[model samples]
Target: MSIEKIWAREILDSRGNPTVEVDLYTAKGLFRAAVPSGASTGIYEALELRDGDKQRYLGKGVLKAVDHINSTIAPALISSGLSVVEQEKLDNLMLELDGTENKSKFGANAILGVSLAVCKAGAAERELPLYRHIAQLAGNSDLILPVPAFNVINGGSHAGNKLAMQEFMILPVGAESFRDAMRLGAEVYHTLKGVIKDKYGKDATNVGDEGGFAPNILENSEALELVKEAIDKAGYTEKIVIGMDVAASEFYRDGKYDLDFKSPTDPSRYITGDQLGALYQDFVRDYPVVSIEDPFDQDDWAAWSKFTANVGIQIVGDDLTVTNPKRIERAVEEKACNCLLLKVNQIGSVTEAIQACKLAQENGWGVMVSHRSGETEDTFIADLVVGLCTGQIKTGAPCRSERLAKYNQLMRIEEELGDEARFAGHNFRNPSVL
Candidate 1:
């Protein structure tokens, strides 16, 4: 089958904000995909065009990006007489069409929307499942289902809490399979909810912005205590360990960090990078924290390098790396982080995302496929994680269906693989060894 037509529309994401969703048609069938919004919302993120007119959808509409696909990309792409299965050629062509390193000409959202839809169409043409097609694209011999890092606790801006850390996760790295990990994560999440509810009644059990339980507290230490108690209460102590997305960029202001950033302004209370690293050490000693994400500013290379050299855990680079090959290359050279939080939207295309993942793997670094704070029903990351054997993922807690959609897809993938399926499990940081 070959490409026949392509159309795009502005659709709402999980957070009710507008995003680009593309529909690609071929003789085999119709394939559609949606771009997840909010890629760290920092300086390094690829440009996601917003109308910004404020007349419709409160300036959140992606009509310009939608038009770029339907009027510009669709016709030029179809007339080139290219097959849909030539994923890299098509992706590179789009990159040339944009003529910008960041895909800023057409907006990364536009290019990625078509990139994903084309990938789905390619799978249909190849007569394979999406993950199988992706496995072929990434040229992997085996499919390893990743350890899902569930964000069971959140304390950051708009979480209606005072803590500065963005995400507190539980990874069932010791589980038997992907399905087993889901069970482990759900039990801990449920137990965590009950634990918070019991401690502060119904008022403290409210789900945070990412569907994690947000205890109304001032310090993140208590948040860690609550999650650890839940792990113990659920009888999955060693089976699951803690991970945190510090998102330090959100709080590092002026020249220092304020642990109590949400409250009224403070100057003398701010702490230096060295002091913050000490606090993280305290966390590691008191809790079973094995991985930490964005513990320093995006521009702070020395800070990241220092923490990574001293900290024994998996230090992740999200904002610091942005899944861009240039950025990742520099981080690897400087030893800034040992893990890469690979977000597809941050760098824009499937091929480039794969490029970044490969670089991390080649450099002996862990790659954690990620979802933005805002998500959609599209399960591309589920297939991508398994296809690339990235070994770990953080889609959010198991509460919201948008988050559950990815977990559900992973279960289906495990069933599809049957005897061939291998779970990352305890070797999540380096599942390639398996």
Candidate 2:
């Protein structure tokens, strides 16, 4: 049996990095595993990342129940031999654990990270790679990791923060070697420390129990502008593409939309079809956005068709498709948007995620491996994107090192794949920028 041991631990990201406080979860007794964090789009919370800056909640609740579930519940189940049960029981338990509430609770990745570790460990013990393990149990063909892209409109500011702080928003550039990954990760921390010093003078970047940006760049447009410039300067123009996380349901506090979902409550219901169309039209007009996600309500197939056909861009379905094979099937039946954002967390396990990816590929729709708001340092998705030959990956803009981690990982993967990696631009029509 290749199954390895399971373990958990917490390590500081940097001197004052506040996004991910600790790293937990490992698989099959191997150190290579995804980290779990409390940061996530609350389940059922109306998506609010699309709204204007002031309405954004950078850290509404640092930890959701799933944070406990990952660090505690799921691991306990795996340790107690519960995971050895039938696949149906595992699926049922997953749903039961996720059924805590309709409102946005803990980040889905929190649970996903831990669950993946447990499954991977068990499968490895049986001499299988994580993907095969998940496939046999979930009846799926492959597994994929969805990297995250930045919510530029709603991501907290980066002004006065160290240029290194930008790496946090991105993955370190040279990750072909694990040593490079570690060194770059450490540099990201130190760079952020310098950013604090530069922005707030000596010792100004300190984040205490109250919680805040290192130099208070939260919601700072100037910081955003600088970070964008840095990204361009770093030569990411051609290599790194940006996507829109326009989850708008949470931000329309004025009661304009028919949906009454609250911010971060569902992160899924951020925008309506009408609103999505308008946003897509405007965003493509001015920004270099290549993909649009959850532009309308998940169930709004009509809106998806309209926006996808009219916007002339990759209309990705996140909240709508959710990496669920059945959901993807229905969307295809409805002729919904042709772009699918692949995030393992949105479903329950790697097995389910792979099924969604294979379905998307089989249908000829573009596949974008995605990252969740809450994430760990694991770069498995980076490898999977290349291994499975996904169309694109959204690891976020050049802001926080956490988001960038996936991006850098992808860059390295692309380097390794050489000419084999096919980017979306090669196939889809580029969005018309004003």
Candidate 3:
């Protein structure tokens, strides 16, 4: 029995946006996976092809991408002995077929869907779990459950508020197991909702793209204070740490960051890179903020290095690295940041994403497997993080079926691993310090 057929169709994401979903048929069974989309994208990231027709889905329709998958991508892989195709070779074949610098020819959304579907089918053929197959591909045997970074509050491009930071995450660093970490996150998330509701009224409970509460809060510091209050109210003061996805590129203009700190009637405050880093430093000192993602703009390499040096906490590169191996290597050599936020769609292929993770691990840099603001119910990243043993994952708050799907899959995996399942915990941060 082998991979006999492949097909694709257009589907809706968590935000009700169009995306590509693929179906791979093997003689044994059928496997399916979907590609996720990101709202606050980086300039250097791979291209997600969308139909520009203004009439449909506000020029966000992905019919052309779906057609490319069904007509071009599927035909090349059907009956090609997919069971025996090496992971790199399979990915390389698609890369060659696309023949674009940023996957614009065939679309990253199309390519990723097929790539993941193939991996799922290959695992089915081998009678192994998806994580086991991926672990073998990455040449790793130690499958550890990653600590979940739950985004309990939303801002910036993800929310309708005027705050400049994109995400405020709660990290369960003191949990002994993945299940325990999930419980801790759920308690904090619900407590955060109540806190916001009490302060900002019932309308404040409205969630953003990733299911985080998006109150009409204007200042970033106010948001951080609220998150701290929630952690304490949940009875997890020291156990739960905090993180932020600044996504500064969204506010960078003409080499200066225009941040909204005061009121909507006033102009945004413009600040240099150093000024922004200083603000982050103050934040770290005041709050239990252990991780700061993309504190500077994507092209500001020197600023990234400066911030990494100044802060004793984790400085992560999301927009800065864009899941590209060369970018990650340069960041490591230059000490741009101590960690990376990996999204498979940012690089367009699973093989490249794995290569990036391996590079980060080789350099002793932390790797965080992340989800996009626009997501689907495909829990492939759950298995991917376990296979790579990246030690950290951020998939929004413990709400919405799309976000909960990944967490639920991890729970099942933890049960399956039984005694072997190890929660990342403090090991995710300083392994040597712990």
lDDT tens digits, residues 88-167, model 3? Answer: 87788889999987888888898889889888877877788988888988888878898999998888877778888889
Top candidate (TM-score): 1
- lDDT agreement with native, every candidate: 0.89, 0.47, 0.86
The candidate that achieves the highest lDDT relative to the unseen native structure: 1
The C-alpha RMSD in Å for every predicted model, in order, reads 1.4, 10.0, 2.1
Mind sharing the TM-score for model 1? 0.97
What is residue 204's positional error in candidate 2, in angstroms? 14
Better of 1 and 3 by lDDT: 1
lDDT of 3: 0.86
TM-score of each: 0.97, 0.54, 0.95
lDDT of 1: 0.89
Write one digit per residue (lDDT tens) for candidate 1, span 107-186.
99999999999999998888989898998998887789999999988877757778789899999988999999999999
lDDT of 2 by residue, 35-102 (tens): 43322354432221111123333333334432554365555455544533233444345546655432
